[PDB]
Design a protein around this ligand. Structure first.
Ligand SMILES: [K+]
Ligand SMILES: [K+]
Ligand SMILES: [K+]
Ligand SMILES: [K+]
Ligand SMILES: [Mg+2]
Ligand SMILES: [Mg+2]
Ligand SMILES: [Mg+2]
Ligand SMILES: [Mg+2]
Ligand SMILES: [Mg+2]
Ligand SMILES: [Mg+2]
Ligand SMILES: [Mg+2]
Ligand SMILES: [Mg+2]
Ligand SMILES: [Mg+2]
Ligand SMILES: [Mg+2]
Ligand SMILES: [Mg+2]
Ligand SMILES: [Mg+2]
Ligand SMILES: [Mg+2]
Ligand SMILES: [Mg+2]
Ligand SMILES: [Mg+2]
Ligand SMILES: [Mg+2]
Ligand SMILES: [Mg+2]
Ligand SMILES: [Mg+2]
Ligand SMILES: [Mg+2]
Ligand SMILES: [Mg+2]
Ligand SMILES: [Mg+2]
Ligand SMILES: [Mg+2]
Ligand SMILES: [Mg+2]
Ligand SMILES: [Mg+2]
Ligand SMILES: [Mg+2]
Ligand SMILES: [Mg+2]
Ligand SMILES: [Mg+2]
Ligand SMILES: [Mg+2]
Ligand SMILES: [Mg+2]
Ligand SMILES: [Mg+2]
Ligand SMILES: [Mg+2]
Ligand SMILES: [Mg+2]
Ligand SMILES: [Mg+2]
Ligand SMILES: [Mg+2]
Ligand SMILES: [Mg+2]
Ligand SMILES: [Mg+2]
Ligand SMILES: [Mg+2]
Ligand SMILES: [Mg+2]
Ligand SMILES: [Mg+2]
Ligand SMILES: [Mg+2]
Ligand SMILES: [Mg+2]
Ligand SMILES: [Mg+2]
Ligand SMILES: [Mg+2]
Ligand SMILES: [Mg+2]
Ligand SMILES: [Mg+2]
Ligand SMILES: [Mg+2]
Ligand SMILES: [Mg+2]
Ligand SMILES: [Mg+2]
Ligand SMILES: [Mg+2]
Ligand SMILES: [Mg+2]
Ligand SMILES: [Mg+2]
Ligand SMILES: [Mg+2]
Ligand SMILES: [Mg+2]
Ligand SMILES: [Mg+2]
Ligand SMILES: [Mg+2]
Ligand SMILES: [Mg+2]
Ligand SMILES: [Mg+2]
Ligand SMILES: [Mg+2]
Lengths: 131, 134
RNA sequence: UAAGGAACUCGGCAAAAUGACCCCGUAACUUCGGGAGAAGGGGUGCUCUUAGAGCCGCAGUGAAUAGGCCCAAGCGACUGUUUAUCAAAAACACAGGUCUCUGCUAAACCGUAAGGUGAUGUAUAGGGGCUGACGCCUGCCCGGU
RNA sequence: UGCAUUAGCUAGUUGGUAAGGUAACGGCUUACCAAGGCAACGAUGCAUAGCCGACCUGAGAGGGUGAUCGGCCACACUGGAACUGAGACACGGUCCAGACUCCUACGGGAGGCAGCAGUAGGGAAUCUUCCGCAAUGGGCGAAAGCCUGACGGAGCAACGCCGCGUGAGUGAGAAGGUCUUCGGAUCGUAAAACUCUGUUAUUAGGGAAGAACAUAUGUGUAAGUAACUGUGCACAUCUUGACGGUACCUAAUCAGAAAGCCACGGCUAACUACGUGCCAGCAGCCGCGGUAAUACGUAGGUGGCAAGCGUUAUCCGGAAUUAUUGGGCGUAAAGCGCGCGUAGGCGGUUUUUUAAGUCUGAUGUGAAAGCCCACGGCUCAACCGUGGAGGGUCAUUGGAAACUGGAAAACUUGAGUGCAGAAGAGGAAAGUGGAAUUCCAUGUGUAGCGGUGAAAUGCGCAGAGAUAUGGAGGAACACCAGUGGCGAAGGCGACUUUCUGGUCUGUAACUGACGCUGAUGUGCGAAAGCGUGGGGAUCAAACAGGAUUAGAUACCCUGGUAGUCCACGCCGUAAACGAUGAGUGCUAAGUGUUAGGGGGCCCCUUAGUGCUGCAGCUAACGCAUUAAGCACUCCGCCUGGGGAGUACGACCGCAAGGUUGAAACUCAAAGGAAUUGACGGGGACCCGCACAAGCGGUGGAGCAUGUGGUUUAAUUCGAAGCAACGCG
RNA sequence: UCCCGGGUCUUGUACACACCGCCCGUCACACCACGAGAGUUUGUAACACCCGAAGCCGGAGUACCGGAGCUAGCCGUCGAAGGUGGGACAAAUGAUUGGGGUGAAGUCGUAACAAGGUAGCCGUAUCGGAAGGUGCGGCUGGAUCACCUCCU
RNA sequence: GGAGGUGACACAUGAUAUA
RNA sequence: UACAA
């Protein structure tokens, strides 16, 4: 059955991005909402809408493509996994693509990026790399 | 495999094997047991000198049968043109198999113990136990 | 019965040795039952206290009675039977196997017959031949009889 | 640290009470009571091993090692004890037992280098039976001092590291060597010649530091004293060096004493000649050598290093070749034949809470030496010293609360239930039926039937085969029938009844994460096979005969037993295959088909089952919403070929065998996909005196001629299937 | 149609020194390692029993006040070594024996690779000098030619 | 046109490297 | 070609 809803979200984005879809819908959760907003804030996706329903909510994402239909998102990668959880300290926060990408980190001050985690001197669970 | 499978059954590297097994064993006479020591050479006595034919190649390759100091029997190649060896000769044996000769995995050291140096050698003498002329 | 201990002898024949009870402990092989009492070892008297403390002898199941054991091979599976009176066995029997005869007034057997056995049974039964537990198996020849 | 091809271990054992015992707690010991304790998170047993700081390697993650220096432990010929003592169950103590060695005058006595040297032995291999207590440290002493194989030094060894030499400047193509396309080229500014230097070397002259002291002798001061002596502290005087006349410095003389080792086909820097002729030899790999060898041996030249240079052995790297970082499993090695299911691993949404994981500070600790950075002393450098940094999965303590975990409470999407429909060779049992095969009987009826490439064996005139009717019996179910259906897989196909499993569609009553996977385990599992008992038509291992063939233990023919069938047990294997593990989600289309549903034959929609085809993936072939795409979870499996799914052990089995499963040794490949050819007793088309249709010859005779073989003094040499032989 | 040879296209191939190709197994030869094997030898460790040292525990002689104390000795429990016994395990070797690897192609055939001349392979059974044959089930990882479903 | 299902006499041998 | 027979 479903074991990693976050990796399912990152893969839904990867598959939709591969075929250059305009948008995609997925069932919602709090961390998936916060992951999506960071992608919006960092400029990887266009917009996030939340659609309420009886079951668990729906997240609508809008993908971004530049001139000549070049993909803004190049890749997504799940780092921490149910089979093997990955944690890091602020002093060992990984840089993604030499700083040209981002790492999503779940810290005790919420879900933030790696550049901000070093700024706040907090570590936590490395959710995913986006570049 | 999965991480859980690796935790249950970790990786195992292949065990390396030695090309000169007769050199890496000693013998304690008092306890009549075999040791493991990694010697670079071993003394031995020639049981039967002679010749053997190669496996495309064709020649009469000189060799000796040697009982090493650890009571192991080996076939050792005699390099160089002419040798002074016969039965009951005391020889020093080093590693290095000779291709085209099946069952010969060792070399006799020229110029050590009873083996003489190659006569008339002038190039690469230290490989054939020959003193510097003149 | 000194010392020896199978040197005796066709052959340890005969004799010696073992031997009871109680407690430890027990191999190959096996048809899983066995082998097994395998083997090999410990304890036994008497008095006193309530398992200990003592006492005596060379010796305590102090007499008599009471398995010797082990390793390996042939034959026969086994218990049983036999030459009364020189042979007890590897011979006979055996459970098991197979072949064959027999439809019942059966076949087979006794008897001249009547009458009987088979059987007050009926083919999962009865008679005869060969083989002989069990395991794996049982090849070729139908020319002759 | 290995090994599960080691699964059971323990009976003072585990706990209790009491006593004893110890520096001390305690089954530490004993007595009595109870039956506990350990183990798949690997007990126990076997094997191996002193452990760490460190060291080697590596980008790192890791892998490998424990010599030297430091910490800890253990041991002192082997085993058992105790004594003295603060401390030992004591290396150079005792007692006892044992092995061994030595003295004896046979009663008796003696000894323990794993201290430093040294000897013998073993070994490929590892040093002097040296000097001194001057320094540092230790024991004893009031001290002087004594003792100290600790230690400080010297000796031997290129064993390693670092440093410096073996000359420097000028010098146009000498001789000699080697090669030569005999012009020359090269060794080569190299040599000689001219000058210059003395690191080193030899001879001589000087000559440190390392030494601090202690004692003693004076003064001063502090405490104390009634006071002194003494004691503590301070200053001043005194003696002391194994190394050693060493380091170092100064002067003189001389290029004179001081270069070797490996390599030169490619990897890989550097080529020629001669000798050799698959020999001799070389070789890490590819491989080299069989008469023109840059690969063998030598020579000249060159390259790489240099007081070293090569070889061997061993470890890490290259090796992503055990892949956490960082690999795989359709066809290359690799998905268990398939279910059910235990432990374990993993697990949907939200709120509150917690604080084990996670994060973030504080404190302590992670010795010294080492590594790395900085600085200082050694003429430099090695090396030495000093100051930092680093290294923990460490502990204790204060905070944070997103994620994982724990608690509580909600939720309905996952998963189940209910209700309403539908399809099905799903399974088990018992019945009914039609065709055909074989056999049997009867009637007609006569000469073959049968079989093959051709035959023969075989059956038949005693009436076959054919034909018609009837009977017996076993086995199997035409048509329907379809990349159709059902089942986990194996599998399931006439019809009827009975018993029974699962799936699909719709609905949204209900429960409220109840899920996924699944080691061990437990079951099912084609065919053959095995046991017991039945049955026996057809077919048919074995077998027989007949053919074919050089042979034919085959293929073909005529028969034919087990078996094929049933029941009940066993066996547990198949190319048990989609050669593709299960679960979940996401990612163009087109078009068939099976079972449904909704709406207006078509459109939409579920769940199966096929074909084609994007993106993506792939070594390619190909896969492609039924993935071999993109992801997460769990399981199984792989790590070159052979040996070998073998051996040994173990478990299972009546047996056949099955499951688990090595190594020695050997090779440099084995292998996958695709490509160009060739070939096929593959296919299609086509052609040639190729066959067919014809005519005339050769092979037989004599002779001519060429050849072979024999001869010979010579019978010259060349040509050898077509394509040598009236050929040059 | 057939014998020899050649051309085009296609198909299979384990061939490329290209079918005068490749290649399998028995038997014979030489070396090597390994298993089995009537047996023989050695080592470890436990167990049980017997004996049992020094030591542990218990039970005549010589500062205090003839006595106390003490020592010597004697007895039993525990005690290393040793001996006895039967097993477990491990290493060595053993007439003979089995299969394997390598070397060389000696011998017999020709099993596989082409439809390899009977398509091959898997399991199983059985037979045979050998490769192998045959039966039953399975697979396509089978060539050539048919009749149908599908796709283009 | 390309796939998937379905069905359909005899002929022995040729050493090693180097190619 | 060098071999093998
Ligand atoms: K009978
Ligand atoms: K007869
Ligand atoms: K001293
Ligand atoms: K062709
Ligand atoms: Mg007597
Ligand atoms: Mg007597
Ligand atoms: Mg006697
Ligand atoms: Mg006698
Ligand atoms: Mg006699
Ligand atoms: Mg008698
Ligand atoms: Mg008695
Ligand atoms: Mg009898
Ligand atoms: Mg009897
Ligand atoms: Mg009688
Ligand atoms: Mg009698
Ligand atoms: Mg008989
Ligand atoms: Mg007859
Ligand atoms: Mg050790
Ligand atoms: Mg690396
Ligand atoms: Mg004491
Ligand atoms: Mg001492
Ligand atoms: Mg000593
Ligand atoms: Mg010494
Ligand atoms: Mg020696
Ligand atoms: Mg001192
Ligand atoms: Mg002294
Ligand atoms: Mg040397
Ligand atoms: Mg070069
Ligand atoms: Mg050489
Ligand atoms: Mg030459
Ligand atoms: Mg070379
Ligand atoms: Mg050379
Ligand atoms: Mg140097
Ligand atoms: Mg390596
Ligand atoms: Mg490596
Ligand atoms: Mg790989
Ligand atoms: Mg997989
Ligand atoms: Mg294969
Ligand atoms: Mg494979
Ligand atoms: Mg499967
Ligand atoms: Mg299988
Ligand atoms: Mg220095
Ligand atoms: Mg219903
Ligand atoms: Mg249904
Ligand atoms: Mg499951
Ligand atoms: Mg399993
Ligand atoms: Mg069957
Ligand atoms: Mg037949
Ligand atoms: Mg049967
Ligand atoms: Mg059955
Ligand atoms: Mg498989
Ligand atoms: Mg999957
Ligand atoms: Mg999927
Ligand atoms: Mg496709
Ligand atoms: Mg579909
Ligand atoms: Mg003609
Ligand atoms: Mg010629
Ligand atoms: Mg002519
Ligand atoms: Mg063939
Ligand atoms: Mg064939
Ligand atoms: Mg046959
Ligand atoms: Mg199948």
């Amino acid at each position: 059955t479903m074991t990693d809803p976050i990796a399912d979200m990152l893969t839904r984005v990867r598959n939709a991005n591969m075929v250059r879809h305009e948008k995609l819908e997925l069932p919602a959760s709090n961390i998936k909402k916060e992951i999506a907003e960071i992608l919006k804030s960092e400029g990887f996706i266009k917009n996030v809408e939340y659609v309420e329903d009886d079951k668990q909510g729906v997240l609508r994402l809008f993908l971004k493509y530049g001139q000549n239909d070049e993909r803004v998102i190049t890749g997504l990668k799940r780092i921490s996994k149910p089979g093997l959880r990955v944690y890091a300290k602020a002093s060992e926060m990984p840089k993604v693509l030499n700083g040209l990408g981002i790492a999503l980190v779940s810290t005790s001050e919420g879900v933030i990026t790696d550049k901000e985690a070093r700024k706040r001197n907090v570590g936590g669970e490395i959710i995913a790399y986006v570049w | 495999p999965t991480i859980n499978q690796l935790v249950r059954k970790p990786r195992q590297s292949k065990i390396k094997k030695s090309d000169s097994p007769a050199l890496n064993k000693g013998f304690n006479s008092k306890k009549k047991k075999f040791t493991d020591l990694n010697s670079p050479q071993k003394r031995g006595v020639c049981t039967r000198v002679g010749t053997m034919t190669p496996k495309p190649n064709s020649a009469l390759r000189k060799y000796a049968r040697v009982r090493l100091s650890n009571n192991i029997e080996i076939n050792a190649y005699i390099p160089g043109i002419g040798h002074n060896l016969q039965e009951h000769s005391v020889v020093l044996v080093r590693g290095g198999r000779v291709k085209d000769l099946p069952g010969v995995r060792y070399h006799i050291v020229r110029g050590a113990l009873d083996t003489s140096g190659v006569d008339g050698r002038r190039q690469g003498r230290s490989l054939y136990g020959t003193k510097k002329p003149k």
